[PDB]
Write a protein that binds this ligand. Structure first.
Ligand SMILES: CN(C)S(=O)(=O)c1ccc(S(=O)(=O)Nc2cccc(Cl)c2N2CCCCC2)cc1
Ligand SMILES: CN(C)S(=O)(=O)c1ccc(S(=O)(=O)Nc2cccc(Cl)c2N2CCCCC2)cc1
Ligand SMILES: CN(C)S(=O)(=O)c1ccc(S(=O)(=O)Nc2cccc(Cl)c2N2CCCCC2)cc1
Ligand SMILES: CN(C)S(=O)(=O)c1ccc(S(=O)(=O)Nc2cccc(Cl)c2N2CCCCC2)cc1
Lengths: 465, 465, 465, 465
């Protein structure tokens, strides 16, 4: 029983010395490191193809339909005169009508079946304005009914083998939007021997006048919908037997690993039950009886199996979720690579990181319990006060990123100098920004981070003795 | 009496064990954390609306009135020929006269009632020059009377249901300025259900020839003056009863918290007086009798109350001070979030930061007493010497920011390379910059910051034992 | 024998005290420091000339042959309409045909003798397309044979004392490439008194349609082939006797140093053999009998000799491998400068770095054995998942550089903000990027790097006592 | 005698306790801190005026005379066709001839009296080419005589109340340069009440064809020569009695401080002599008898006096050396501010920095003796090898700056990614750059800097006990 515990907690090498047992688990892990990473790279090929197709098509759409658009300046691209706005709208519609003989890609028109489009309509030109707006800055009066009324113009694609009478209602205009859909085939998914899928891009061009500030920003956004094409033909394409068989091999390897890990977990549970019965005959250690590396391994096994099933679906053309498949496979690869420290824990010369973390975690958790309220106060204050003026405080996640980078001494002078323009106008906000940044930087770089590192190194000093 | 001191210095949990007292103060603080942050976000909505309106209107004005202006290049935008200057001025005036049928926003003209404008004048075209200037570089002579004479041209807005004869006097010109005012309504303050305010933008276009260097920079600045509109009408607007009631709720919560904190402070003062009388019967500790977290809490309470009153005024349209209101509310939110460490001080496992700071503060103050004179010497020297040549040393605050960023290892190579242009011309200044930067960086990163962190970590080592 | 060991392990100064022996080895090293660095600089002159000629010629070719090309934007330079593509191609060919009377450099045409060019052809205009492509996005069908067929047009340079009928086959176009060669003489290799070499630039202009996304990027790449000119004449050029004699001097100095170092190594081997025989009469220390600074010195000697031979070949016009010669000479210079710490090892006040490294190396190796699997897991995951979306994760080496910079707190906010565009589209990938970056930064800056520095400083603390 | 030593080494406060002596030296230092800084700022005003005039005039000259010049792109501005070069040259000459009626500044022409200009010539148009050049890349031959022949065209300014026949000899052209001088008056030196000086700008426009690579960069450089104008007149200018009297006050304060410091030094020398005589009756401590703060104070006094004399000369219009005056005054201000630590040395609670440095200096010097050879090897290798390819390794000072910034973790990813272009072409150089950067960063950030900080903190630990 005590020798049973000895055997159960023995290292793999001394286990092999004891019973001449070849570490089948270790061999499975070693081959798992290679198979999971190879599968991740092979999937990454197709993921790159799909993302590249989407992004390059969006860039081509911007250059085709936005008048005067240049690379960069996706923001700071607006209309400032009525003639500029009219020219932008009419250029977008004209380029839509002239696509098939001016574009470098081959696109197909989608006749209306959806929300803005009527039957036969390919492009919907909608302007939205207040139901009743009497804006008169001269007499400081306005009688406004802020109910948005939508007025759409339907444009039919030319049939080859009205929209220019648009009055825009500038004083109460909310926004002008252009909706159309384009079908295209991802032919680049042919160097990878996968067959080309059929894509449908839903293009939305927005002329945003919600601020009513005399500046109307213009943006173009696309949504891509992948689906299989109808009875396609590729000359001597062949099969992807190798890809399918490798996916099956990865599935089987991860299944064997999962089964062995679950068997070891259940054996440890039975031994824990027997030992607690022994003690009763004669609750923070019975949990210590359990192996957390096996929890990590089973989590990684289920992640890899889910990712491989999703990838098989993607290659069989049913489920087009490249982001989900990539996230699953990448997380499983990371956990698989991390899980080899398990065989460095026994040596006591190689597990310095693991032992130091195990000792340092509670103190770090309490220190974080305090630093969290400090950090959240600073985040909320910075967000709300400096957000309208600072480009790095626009949203809460952006504020968190900026402050976390400042703690590590990144972009400090840029953060300071993004308010030199406000030094002259809103000098009070500029002075508040100075005090806020100086206080946060001093307190967190010099007082808090020092104590964090001190806790970690003190735990290391405890471990090494 | 000693048990009275025991009770007075007991933690909240042991206080509840002692007298079964529910920590009403703690409950008030907990709900205060939520109410103050929610109020800060709700105010931030309107603050964002106002700041966005101002900035976007200024950008639209720049693009409308500055000839050849593009986004970016707010600096490095100048005239270099007489024809360029004349075209810029005439384009600005022509765009002013053509606004109502070319701009995307709706603006109203303001007839003259102020400093540069006469009765009926909307735009004032003023050039300023020396009273008598005879500049003759050929004979190296000049008879100059440097009294600035102002010559203004008044332009009346077109009345719909002379300025081109401007001689500019280039050889003694000081500056040319264009003044006009525009009224507009912030209609975007309607998605927030607040009613639109009436704004008046005072636009100033400056053609600055003060350097007399053949380059005349052009800039546009605006001042926005918010006021309520006259008898406006919004169809089914409703009230902001919820906003007003939540402001009242925040006020009442902060008032209760302030009253409890002041009661505890006065009780502690009475106990201190009683104890000192006891000692006299039988001055750095009687102050220690006092709670600094209650000082922080009362400061936060008064800040929150002032901010809420100002916000109520803003929503009632009387006081338009968004920067002051935002600064008050953000500072109060930061202090409110910081004030929960007060309940982590008792545990002795969570107040590592507070104890380390309490021990480390005096040594840090003395070390700063020395490093302050070192830092100020470096700041003044850098400012005056490298200011004309370095873009990051233009002003004293900018020098302080640059040096503080250099201490944290930020923008080091950019700071070094901003003088590669001066390596060839003013090689002496380039060499001085090299020595200055190397010396400052070495001395402060390696000698001073190391001792600062050493003081803080030594105080931590004192605390943890 | 023991006094023999004393003499063999004595420092140079005490050796001179013992036998009055002038350290000829030390003198050779001292003069070697100067000769190797001077030779490296002298070679760097010619290396700079050659690299400058190549790069400036490539820039001139880009500006000459790429229509609408501006400095910068080597990427983000593409065609988006059929007319743009045709104009770019025809402009490239027209500039090729008009070079000799429009270019600022003097170039010669190379009639065809190679792969794309026929006899007499100077420029080859090749378009590549699928052998059979029936792309029809309207019916979601395609009958494709993905065998690339090449169609080349041959252009003959004008003879001074057809290509415009190009149909491009857009729907199945793979790429369009322009191949031509230009000969020129590097006249700038005359201020260095070396004679001008004759260069042949092979220019390749690519119009890449492999993505079939409606955007065709355009790039220009050149390959330079250096060779000696036929019977050139420079008036009173003179010889490079000084350069050749200095190369011979460097060779002789390094040869003497190599001979002395090998003699000392063989003497140490003989002494080790004698001592081990002594012990046998009476395996990790017999290797310690050996001097690793002499291994470093012989490696540096052979590197310097190889580099000098290659440099002599370069100046004698036979072997044009400037990159190989520069790498050899620079590595030898670095090792030569490093090799003077050998005379600081004896003092025990100056070899703190060497002793600390000697003590700290094994623990660092084991810690790296663990951190390597952690780092590789993170690298693979980041590469495959964030590569399509993040500009700093495009390739595996780029991922390694990005993560290594993040460990040192560089470009943190830029890395975080390169996904704000994906926050809206692919919010799942944006959230994964947030978690990935936060986890990696925390774990490696705060836990791993702290323990690395702790190991190094603990080894130092061991040494200093 | 021993009480004499007690008095001589007593602190100022205990000296005042001893003999009731008011610290006149301390009072002089305190007023010196203010007077020197005020003088530095007052001089910085005029220094800023002069530097601003020079730089803005150079910018105006660039925009006036360089065809197609835009802000930025001072580099990457070149000609690539013969027509571009001719148009640039002719535009420069035409703008020179049309200055007085197109420029915004008032300039005067300088008829020839110097090197390139003949009598009456204002502009010299010189082209330089090889004396005999027969460049023939077709036959791989050239008969060249590399003696530069200069051919200048003289242009006379128009007389108001030939250069277009320029043949450029492209195949053997070395460079084309345009020389002319312009006189102007710095009128901005009138808001400071200093009178305007007369400036003479020597403009040099270079068309550099030294590389013979088909790309000819174009640059403009100016040299400014300040001198007093002839009998100028400013209406009611007044005197600068205040400035002169304040300069005299600074001179007198620094003179009194210097006299007291030298008296104390000589008294200490006499006491040292007496003590050594005492010891002889009964050499590293007799130097310790001396005060280094008095050496620093006398250095600062002589620097301030020299700077004030130079500033008086500048304001009296004799010596125009603003860079020298600024460097002297700024260095003196820095030393003056540093010299107050002298009164914090006695307290033993405020001189932690000084004591730590005094203890740590020798070990730091030896560690630097080793790290210096390591750093120099890396600097030379990086310079010569990566210089032609990396933008941050172009010169030796730039290499030193880049490596020093890398040690502090600055611009790491930018330094890594400046070779992604060379990954494809010169992959060997790219791989060498990878190895070089990784090795340098690891060795210096993790091994060397750690031991440097360890030495400094160990000296602090010695001091604090
Ligand atoms: C950055 N330093 C180590 S710090 O200055 O000492 C510090 C700052 C902020 C907190 S936190 O409680 O607010 N949590 C938090 C918030 C944002 C980003 C992150 Cl990664 C964190 N983590 C810190 C590491 C453990 C996991 C949580 C704690 C310490
Ligand atoms: C940056 N390091 C910790 S440092 O190199 O050791 C150091 C530098 C400068 C001084 S200072 O006396 O001049 N004060 C000062 C000046 C500018 C910005 C700031 Cl935040 C400060 N504060 C330092 C932290 C406490 C509050 C004051 C002291 C230490
Ligand atoms: C950066 N820190 C010191 S670290 O966070 O503690 C750390 C990170 C990564 C590893 S590694 O095992 O993966 N090796 C590795 C991978 C990429 C670049 C480099 Cl230079 C290395 N070297 C680290 C220094 C010794 C030589 C190898 C180890 C420590
Ligand atoms: C940067 N760290 C502290 S370091 O990695 O430990 C280190 C790097 C380089 C040397 S050096 O001997 O080559 N001298 C040197 C060369 C360039 C710039 C500078 Cl500021 C220096 N100084 C270092 C501080 C004292 C004065 C000299 C020494 C230490």
């Amino acid at each position: 029983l005590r020798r049973r515990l000895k055997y159960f907690f023995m290292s793999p090498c001394d286990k092999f010395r004891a019973k001449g047992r070849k570490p089948c688990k270790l061999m499975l892990q070693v081959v798992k490191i290679l198979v999971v990473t190879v599968q991740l790279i092979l999937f990454g090929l197709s993921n790159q193809l799909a993302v590249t197709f989407r992004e390059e098509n969006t860039i081509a759409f911007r250059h085709l339909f936005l008048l005067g658009y240049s690379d960069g300046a996706d923001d700071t691209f607006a209309a400032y005169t009525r003639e500029q706005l009219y020219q932008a709208i009419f250029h977008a519609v004209d380029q839509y009508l002239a696509l098939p003989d001016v574009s470098l890609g081959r696109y197909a028109y989608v006749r209306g079946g959806g929300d803005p489009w009527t039957n036969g309509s390919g492009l919907a030109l909608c302007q939205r304005y207040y139901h009743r707006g009497h804006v008169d800055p001269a007499n400081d009066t306005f009688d406004i009914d802020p109910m948005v009324v939508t007025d759409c113009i339907q444009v039919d694609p030319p049939e080859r083998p009205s929209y220019k009478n648009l009055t825009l209602k500038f004083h109460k205009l909310v926004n002008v939007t252009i909706h159309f859909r384009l079908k295209t085939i991802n032919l680049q998914s042919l160097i990878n021997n996968e067959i080309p899928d059929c894509y449908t891009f839903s293009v939305l061009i927005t002329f945003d006048n919600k601020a009513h500030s005399g500046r109307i920003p213009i943006s173009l956004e696309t949504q891509a919908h992948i689906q299989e094409c109808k009875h396609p033909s590729v000359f001597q394409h062949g099969d992807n037997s190798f890809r399918l068989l490798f996916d099956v091999v990865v599935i089987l390897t991860c299944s064997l690993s999962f089964l062995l890990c679950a068997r070891s977990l259940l054996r440890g549970f039975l031994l824990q039950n027997e030992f607690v019965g022994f003690m009763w005959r004669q609750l923070w250690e019975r949990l210590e009886f359990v192996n957390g590396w096996y929890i990590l391994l089973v989590t990684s096994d289920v992640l890899t199996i889910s990712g491989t099933i999703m990838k098989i679906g993607i290659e069989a053309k049913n489920l087009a979720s490249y982001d989900v498949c990539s996230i699953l496979l990448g997380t499983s690869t990371l956990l698989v690579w991390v899980g080899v420290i398990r065989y460095l824990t026994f040596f006591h010369n190689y597990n310095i990181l693991i032992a130091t973390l195990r000792v340092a975690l509670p103190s770090v958790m309490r220190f974080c319990c305090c630093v969290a309220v400090i950090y959240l106060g600073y985040c909320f204050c910075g967000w709300i006060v400096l957000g309208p003026y600072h480009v790095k405080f626009r949203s809460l996640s952006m504020v968190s990123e900026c402050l976390f980078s400042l703690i590590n001494g990144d972009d400090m002078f840029v953060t300071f100098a993004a308010m030199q323009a406000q030094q002259g106008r809103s000098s009070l906000v500029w002075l508040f920004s100075q005090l806020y940044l100086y206080s946060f930087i001093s307190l967190f770089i010099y007082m808090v981070l020092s104590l964090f590192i001190a806790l970690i190194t003190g735990a290391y000093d405890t471990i090494k003795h």
